[PDB]
Amino acid sequence: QVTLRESGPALVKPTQTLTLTCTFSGFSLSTSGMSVGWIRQPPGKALEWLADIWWDDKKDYNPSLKSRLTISKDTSANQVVLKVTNMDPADTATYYCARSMITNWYFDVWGAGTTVTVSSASTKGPSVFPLAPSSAAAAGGTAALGCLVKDYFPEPVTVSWNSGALTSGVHTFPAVLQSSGLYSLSSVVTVPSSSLGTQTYICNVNHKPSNTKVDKRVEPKSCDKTH
Amino acid sequence: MTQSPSTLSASVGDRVTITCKCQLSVGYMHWYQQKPGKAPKLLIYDTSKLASGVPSRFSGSGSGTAFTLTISSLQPDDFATYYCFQGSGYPFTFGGGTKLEIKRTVAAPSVFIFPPSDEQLKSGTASVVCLLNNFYPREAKVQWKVDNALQSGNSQESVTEQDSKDSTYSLSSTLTLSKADYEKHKVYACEVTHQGLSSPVTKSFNRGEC
């Protein structure tokens, strides 16, 4: 099928240059009419067109940004590169590359997008803590449990349950930057009360920006008391 | 360019019309559908051509400086931010967006409270989490009470994007305390006020009950 994939550093420092790479397949940039463009989206803002390059090497740029942008391709390597100079905090956004077919349609296929944060703060991997099920017994309908993923930078982190096998009822809350300057979030899942103590639940946390992965088992708590 | 409305809440079955007005005459318009934090999906190209794999429910029209996107009878999975794109002339531009929310019946939140793990406490900090699960409308007030004393400025909330199936929301309120302060108190309660609740629900635990 036709696929596009963006890659680059997850964090860049103010004034530095960002180099993004769009690797694609399912098509060739040599095919007449083919084009690959770049679009970005700041957290909570609208899409903004950045630039594009045609099969014949014609390059087009957003006027507001032209000065800082350089687009190029390597058909041999099936990749288009966008270099953005003098990065500013306002450039923090998710960057997408997309395929277009001139005289036919714009952006019919997009990459998944890669998050870029412009900050002076350093990379930090997350710590993961269990949100143990308040339940313990079977007959009780449904129990909620989850994982607290805190003190990491920058975005993003991904959370799965039982290596992807558990997806129904999962809610992974949007990260929120704490006053400490580090992000934190919880991923919760509701399961059968009867499964507590018998079914193993594990949250798998991946923080690509720091190449950190953490699996955390979540189980009912053993109470400290006079037994 | 100018897109409107910026936001809209409409019931299932409703007919919805989004408009993009450019100051400059436009040849043709493209429309995209973007699910939260996911990549945009092409809906309409050449002003009115339905893209492949797009419900006949959506349609585009317009000319000159004004173009429109229409969803004949909205439905749960239509929750998304819609964008028009003008690539027929310079400068190429996207619309500011129209975030579409789907209206549904009131649904009360299922509330859960989670005490800090012994593991986190070791690190010197205590996070107390309160979950309000699968509710609607989105407005909900959650107050933390430590030993009956109302907390202020020591918690953050995070709300989930509307569910594409049940048009519901989930929210987490997180209370952060130093291990020192956490051990200075007994009862931690999360009180939830919501339209679907005849009276505030309170979930709590006593430090040390387990």
Say if residue A50 is in the same domain as residue A149: no
Say if residue A106 is in the same domain as residue A196: no
CB atoms within 10 A of CB B173: 22
Domain boundaries, position B149: 105-210
Token reading at A126: 């997350």
Instruction: Using the 3D structure, point to which of B104, B133, B162 is the last residue of a domain.
Output: B104
- Pairing between β-strand B66-71 and β-strand B58-63 as defined by DSSP bridges: antiparallel
Say if residue A157 is in the same domain as residue A198: yes
Q: One-letter amino acid identity for B5?
A: P
- Chain A residues at the B interface, defined by Cβ less than 8 Å, are 39, 46-49, 60, 62-63, 94, 96, 104-108, 110-113, 127, 129-132, 134, 142, 144, 146, 148, 150, 171, 173-176, 178, 184-186, 188, 190, 221, 223-225
Under DSSP, is residue A76 helix (H, G, I), strand (E, B) or coil? helix
Say if residue A3 is in the same domain as residue A114: yes
Q: What is the separation of C-alpha B64 from the centre of its chain, rounded to a whole number of angstroms?
A: 34
Distance, CA of A65 to CA of A60 (rounded, Å) = 11
Under DSSP, is residue A13 helix (H, G, I), strand (E, B) or coil? coil
Strands of the A158-161 sheet, one edge to the other: A158-161, A201-207, A212-218
Residues of B with Cβ-Cβ distance to A188 under 8 angstroms: 112, 131, 133, 170, 172
Which residues of chain A come before a gap where C and the next N are over 2.5 Å apart? Answer: none
* Cβ–Cβ < 8 Å for A91, A43: no
User: What's the total number of domains in chain A?
Assistant: 2
Say if residue A26 is in the same domain as residue A96: yes
What CATH number is given to the structural domain containing B59? 2.60.40.10
Under DSSP, is residue A91 helix (H, G, I), strand (E, B) or coil? helix
Tokens 């001139």 correspond to what residue?
Answer: A102
Closest to B158 (Cα-Cα) out of B177, B175, B173, B139:
B173
Instruction: Using the 3D structure, point to which of A65, A99, A120 is the last residue of a domain.
Output: A120
Minimum-distance CB partner of B114 among A104, A132, A225: A132
Distance, CA of A173 to CA of B177 (rounded, Å) = 20
Instruction: Using the 3D structure, point to which of B57, B77, B104 is the last residue of a domain.
Output: B104
Distance, CA of B75 to CA of B50 (rounded, Å) = 18
* In a domain? residue A226: no
Q: Phi and psi (nearest 5°) for B60?
A: -125, 150
Instruction: Give resolution in angstroms.
Output: 1.8
Q: Give the technique used to solve this structure.
A: X-ray
Token reading at A36: 């690959």
* Cβ–Cβ < 8 Å for B32, B39: no
Say if residue A65 is in the same domain as residue A146: no
Distance, CA of A203 to CA of A149 (rounded, Å) = 10
If you write DSSP's letter for every residue of chain B in order, what string do you get? -EEE-SEEEEETT--EEEEEE-SS--S--EEEEE-TTS--EEEEETTTEEPTT--TTEEEEEETTEEEEEESS--GGG-EEEEEEE-SSSSPEE---EEEEEE---BPPEEEEEPPPHHHHHTTEEEEEEEEEEEBSS--EEEEEETTEEP-SSEEEEEPPPPTTT--EEEEEEEEEEHHHHTT--EEEEEEE-TT-SS-EEEEEETT--
Give the DSSP H/E element, type plus range, for residue A202.
strand A201-207
Say if residue B96 is in the same domain as residue B2: yes
Say if residue B120 is in the same domain as residue B184: yes
Indicate the length of chain A as a whole number: 227
* Cβ–Cβ < 8 Å for B36, A44: no
Token reading at A161: 């349950």
Do the chains contact at A104 and B40, CB–CB below 8 Å?
A: no
Closest to B171 (Cα-Cα) out of B126, B113, B127, B130:
B130
> In sequence order, which residues have a C-beta less than 8 Å from that of residue B159 and are 6 or more positions away?
A173, A174, B138, B169, B170, B171
Under DSSP, is residue A159 helix (H, G, I), strand (E, B) or coil? strand
Distance, CA of B19 to CA of B60 (rounded, Å) = 10
Say if residue A200 is in the same domain as residue A126: yes
Closest to A203 (Cα-Cα) out of A178, A223, A173:
A173
Distance, CA of B117 to CA of A221 (rounded, Å) = 9
Say if residue B97 is in the same domain as residue B118: no
The upper half-sphere exposure of residue B172, i.e. CA atoms within 13 Å in the direction of its Cβ, equals 28
CB atoms within 10 A of CB B183: 13
Domain boundaries, position A181: 121-219
Do the chains contact at B96 and A46, CB–CB below 8 Å?
A: yes
